[PDB]
Amino acid sequence: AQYNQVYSTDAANFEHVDHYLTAESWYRPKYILKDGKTWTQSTEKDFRPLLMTWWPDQETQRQYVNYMNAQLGIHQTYNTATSPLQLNLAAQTIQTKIEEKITAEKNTNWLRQTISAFVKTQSAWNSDSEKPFDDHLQKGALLYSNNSKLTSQANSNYRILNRTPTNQTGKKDPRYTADRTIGGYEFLLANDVDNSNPVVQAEQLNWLHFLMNFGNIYANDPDANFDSIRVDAVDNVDADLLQIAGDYLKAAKGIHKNDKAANDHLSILEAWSYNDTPYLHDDGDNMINMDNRLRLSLLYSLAKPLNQRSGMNPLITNSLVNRTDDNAETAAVPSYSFIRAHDSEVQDLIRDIIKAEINPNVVGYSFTMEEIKKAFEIYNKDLLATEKKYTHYNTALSYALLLTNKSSVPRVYYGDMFTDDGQYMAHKTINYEAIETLLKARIKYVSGGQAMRNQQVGNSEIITSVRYGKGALKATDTGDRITRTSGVVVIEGNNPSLRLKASDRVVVNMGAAHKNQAYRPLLLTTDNGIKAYHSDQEAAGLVRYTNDRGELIFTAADIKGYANPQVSGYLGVWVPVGAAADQDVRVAASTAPSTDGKSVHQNAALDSRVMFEGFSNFQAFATKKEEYTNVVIAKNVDKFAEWGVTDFEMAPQYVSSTDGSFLDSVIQNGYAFTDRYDLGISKPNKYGTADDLVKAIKALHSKGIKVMADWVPDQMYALPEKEVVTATRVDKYGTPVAGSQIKNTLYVVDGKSSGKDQQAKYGGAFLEELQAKYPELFARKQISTGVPMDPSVKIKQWSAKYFNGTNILGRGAGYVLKDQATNTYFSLVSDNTFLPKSLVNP
Numbered sequence: 001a002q003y004n005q006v007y008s009t010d011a012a013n014f015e016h017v018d019h020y021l022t023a024e025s026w027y028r029p030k031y032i033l034k035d036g037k038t039w040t041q042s043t044e045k046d047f048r049p050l051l052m053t054w055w056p057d058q059e060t061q062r063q064y065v066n067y068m069n070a071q072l073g074i075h076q077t078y079n080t081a082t083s084p085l086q087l088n089l090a091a092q093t094i095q096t097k098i099e100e101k102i103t104a105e106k107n108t109n110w111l112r113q114t115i116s117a118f119v120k121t122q123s124a125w126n127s128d129s130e131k132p133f134d135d136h137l138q139k140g141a142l143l144y145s146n147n148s149k150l151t152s153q154a155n156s157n158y159r160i161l162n163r164t165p166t167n168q169t170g171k172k173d174p175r176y177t178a179d180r181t182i183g184g185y186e187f188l189l190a191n192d193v194d195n196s197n198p199v200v201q202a203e204q205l206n207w208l209h210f211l212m213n214f215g216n217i218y219a220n221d222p223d224a225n226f227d228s229i230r231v232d233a234v235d236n237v238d239a240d241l242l243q244i245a246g247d248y249l250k251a252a253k254g255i256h257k258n259d260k261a262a263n264d265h266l267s268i269l270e271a272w273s274y275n276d277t278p279y280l281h282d283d284g285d286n287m288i289n290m291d292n293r294l295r296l297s298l299l300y301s302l303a304k305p306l307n308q309r310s311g312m313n314p315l316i317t318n319s320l321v322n323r324t325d326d327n328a329e330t331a332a333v334p335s336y337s338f339i340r341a342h343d344s345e346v347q348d349l350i351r352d353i354i355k356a357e358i359n360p361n362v363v364g365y366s367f368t369m370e371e372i373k374k375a376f377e378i379y380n381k382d383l384l385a386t387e388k389k390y391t392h393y394n395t396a397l398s399y400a401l402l403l404t405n406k407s408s409v410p411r412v413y414y415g416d417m418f419t420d421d422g423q424y425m426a427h428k429t430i431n432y433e434a435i436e437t438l439l440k441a442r443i444k445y446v447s448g449g450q451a452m453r454n455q456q457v458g459n460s461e462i463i464t465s466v467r468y469g470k471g472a473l474k475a476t477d478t479g480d481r482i483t484r485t486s487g488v489v490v491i492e493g494n495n496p497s498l499r500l501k502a503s504d505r506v507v508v509n510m511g512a513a514h515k516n517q518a519y520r521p522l523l524l525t526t527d528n529g530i531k532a533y534h535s536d537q538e539a540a541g542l543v544r545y546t547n548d549r550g551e552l553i554f555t556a557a558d559i560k561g562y563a564n565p566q567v568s569g570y571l572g573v574w575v576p577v578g579a580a581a582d583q584d585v586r587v588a589a590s591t592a593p594s595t596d597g598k599s600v601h602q603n604a605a606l607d608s609r610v611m612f613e614g615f616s617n618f619q620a621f622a623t624k625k626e627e628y629t630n631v632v633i634a635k636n637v638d639k640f641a642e643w644g645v646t647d648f649e650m651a652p653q654y655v656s657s658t659d660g661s662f663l664d665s666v667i668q669n670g671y672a673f674t675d676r677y678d679l680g681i682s683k684p685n686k687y688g689t690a691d692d693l694v695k696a697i698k699a700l701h702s703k704g705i706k707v708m709a710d711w712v713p714d715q716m717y718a719l720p721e722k723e724v725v726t727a728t729r730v731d732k733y734g735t736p737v738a739g740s741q742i743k744n745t746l747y748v749v750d751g752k753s754s755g756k757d758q759q760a761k762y763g764g765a766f767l768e769e770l771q772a773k774y775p776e777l778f779a780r781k782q783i784s785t786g787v788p789m790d791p792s793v794k795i796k797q798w799s800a801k802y803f804n805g806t807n808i809l810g811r812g813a814g815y816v817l818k819d820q821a822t823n824t825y826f827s828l829v830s831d832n833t834f835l836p837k838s839l840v841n842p
């Protein structure tokens with residue numbers, strides 16, 4: 001009894017969290033039974049575990065001896081039958097052995113840990129009370145109560161959930177109907193930042209500005225800023241952030257004034273809902289979104305297994321732009337196109353491989369480093385197979401359309417040019433040649449109106465895609481010298497068993513500027529792969545002519561199906577003969593004032609851009625300075641120039657967390673981070689040091705290339721400090737989970753930043769300069785909240801009050817200790833102290 005009770009009931013006497021007690025709390029007893037022999041006065045050194053002497057119920061005080069009788073080598077145990085009395089000596093017997101084992105161990109860490117192991121063995125302290133799980137990527141979420149007396153420092157007047165672009169107002173937008181859902185959901189991974197909180201919005205703005213001024217702020221070098229941003233996980237945050245970020249580009253960079261200004265800071269969303277493009281358009285085209293339909297069309301018409309491949313027509317018409325005849329000087333809506341990304345169609349395929357040939361139950365993308373490399377042997381091998389079982393077919397065919405299509409900024413994926421695993425740019429993919437050739441031809445030849453045709457021939461079908469040449473929007477436009485020596489034609493089949501009859505002819509119209517002209521191949525499919533023609537010269541043997549009307553004509557002699565590691569179907573591309581070594585048909589954005597109330601315009605100048613996604617989730621880690629990506633990037637700034645890369649999308653530069661709780665923090669891509677401002681500052685990030693970063697931004701700028709910052713306002717990982725919140729189990733939309741036990745109940749989260757990281761340094765730091773120069777950003781009443789941002793407080797330290805909630809942590813429904821008689825939390829706040837009866841009054 002007595003000695004065991006609490007030395008005194010001050011906060012100082014307990015390891016508590018927000019003045020609550022957890023099943024893992026140690027405390028300071030009055031005396032310690034020194035070496036279970038005699039009873040000293042507790043000095044401030046003398047902290048013992050609570051469970052050593054108190055138990056939530058008797059039933060738990062039971063497993064506790066049993067389990068602890070194991071450890072210390074006592075060789076008794078009791079079943080459910082036993083009297084209280086015995087359980088109570090068993091435990092004192094257990095305590096002596098704990099001192100005698102603390103003296104002889106000269107510490108008490110060995111116990112820190114037999115305790116923990118045991119807490120873990122118990123339901124209410126363990127995932128079991130967290131079920132049932134749901135389809136959240138990490139199995140479940142906890143939503144934090146807005147109003148709890150128990151945890152008032154964690155209250156909030158916001159935590160408005162699910163305000164995606166479609167649902168920004170708390171009701172599905174009537175305007176946009178292609179996606180009939182509400183267009184996203186709130187909880188994605190880790191600690192969900194509540195971007196419906198006006199103070200937080202302000203802070204995202206702070207952060208945005210900082211990124212965009214990185215050079216000035218961090219290196220004092222105006223030449224090292226990020227030019228643009230990518231908004232990550234749009235469909236999982238409050239869309240207010242879109243007017244916020246849009247407002248900022250307009251106020252600080254003037255993108256709304258003319259295209260030249262707009263294109264120098266060209267920014268994108270990652271927004272998957274079909275509703276997000278029209279949404280963004282009506283919002284003023286202040287950044288551009290992906291073309292989701294065209295991506296899907298390429299995926300299914302070209303990349304999928306031969307038996308799951310669809311017809312080719314969708315390559316022409318399932319897109320934001322119908323490319324049957326695209327003759328518009330400016331497209332109705334701007335966008336970027338891609339076939340693969342760092343996540344889309346990469347990490348999927350790896351998960352496919354694990355699930356299929358390594359771990360059957362693997363969850364979401366919570367892979368191990370193990371599984372991954374195991375997976376990559378299968379994958380790299382399939383990459384070279386003609387019959388692919390996991391990886392894409394026809395990569396070159398997809399890039400041929402992406403790089404010649406009109407009315408979209410094509411984004412090339414690093415991993416389609418270099419190996420998805422492996423040191424930065426160390427190994428070229430089998431497609432690097434064709435892609436590079438296209439990239440280079442694009443600069444020289446791709447310009448003008450477009451026509452695409454789908455023709456049924458032989459036993460299958462082909463499509464033709466043609467670009468008329470610089471400054472001919474129409475088939476009848478005749479243009480000038482340069483028109484004559486520009487344009488291109490791509491011909492594609494998606495069926496290895498394509499056969500033309502002898503009489504069959506694919507008659508392509510190349511445009512008025514092209515009568516009676518010699519053309520030569522650029523790429524041709526061959527039995528083993530695809531053959532690239534780097535100049536007129538190199539292709540002298542294979543010239544062919546257009547006729548009187550500017551038509552190229554093709555025959556069984558040219559077109560037939562193939563099956564090799566590169567092509568499953570048919571690819572042919574032709575270009576006019578006689579273009580100057582240095583011919584360049586791209587075109588510069590004009591400074592003429594914009595008058596349509598949009599910022600970005602999909603015109604010839606925007607089509608002149610190419611975006612490069614310059615990383616891979618699955619890159620090797622650098623073994624040495626020379627291998628750091630940002631080091632390598634600076635050194636190869638010329639290749640990108642040579643490819644026509646105008647916008648370099650860098651990976652997120654935040655220093656990665658390493659808890660391993662998701663793929664992101666296993667391979668450290670930079671989407672999982674604890675410090676928003678720590679861009680390789682406190683230690684190198686996967687890609688190099690903050691200085692290596694600066695130099696790579698500088699290198700790219702030296703070529704005039706723009707550099708994009710991945711803005712990640714959705715979540716944060718691995719917060720160092722604990723906090724107690726009032727929590728509820730919820731699925732990804734924030735709906736309470738049926739039959740869960742965690743319902744408005746205290747939970748200990750990892751919800752606090754260190755108060756002394758970069759965040760502490762820069763949080764809210766420029767709010768003041770921002771309100772001074774751009775007062776209108778702070779005038780706007782944000783849509784979901786009805787009110788402006790609130791810069792009146794700075795976020796110096798993240799804490800649960802700025803979050804919506806968190807992924808379950810496996811701590812349990814009863815981790816915060818409760819008197820079961822009264823059903824009350826124990827509390828150590830000094831006016832209101834409430835302690836386990838035995839410990840205070842024995």
Ligand SMILES: C[C@H]1O[C@H](O[C@H]2[C@H](O)[C@@H](O)[C@@H](O[C@H]3[C@H](O)[C@@H](O)[C@@H](O)O[C@@H]3CO)O[C@@H]2CO)[C@H](O)[C@@H](O)[C@@H]1N[C@H]1C=C(CO)[C@@H](O)[C@H](O)[C@H]1O
Nearest residue numbers: 184189232233234235236270272342343344664671712714
């Ligand atoms: C990875 C990505 O996930 C989140 O987006 C999800 C979409 O909301 C879901 O729709 C589904 O997207 C699918 C499309 O609806 C469907 O058309 C089909 O094409 O497949 C699409 C993807 O398979 O799945 C997506 C994820 O389940 C989220 O909005 C986005 O942030 C996520 N990407 C970023 C997230 C992080 C961390 O923030 C990193 O892992 C990624 O690399 C980021 O790019």
Ligand SMILES: [Ca+2]
Nearest residue numbers: 186192236237
């Ligand atoms: Ca969110």
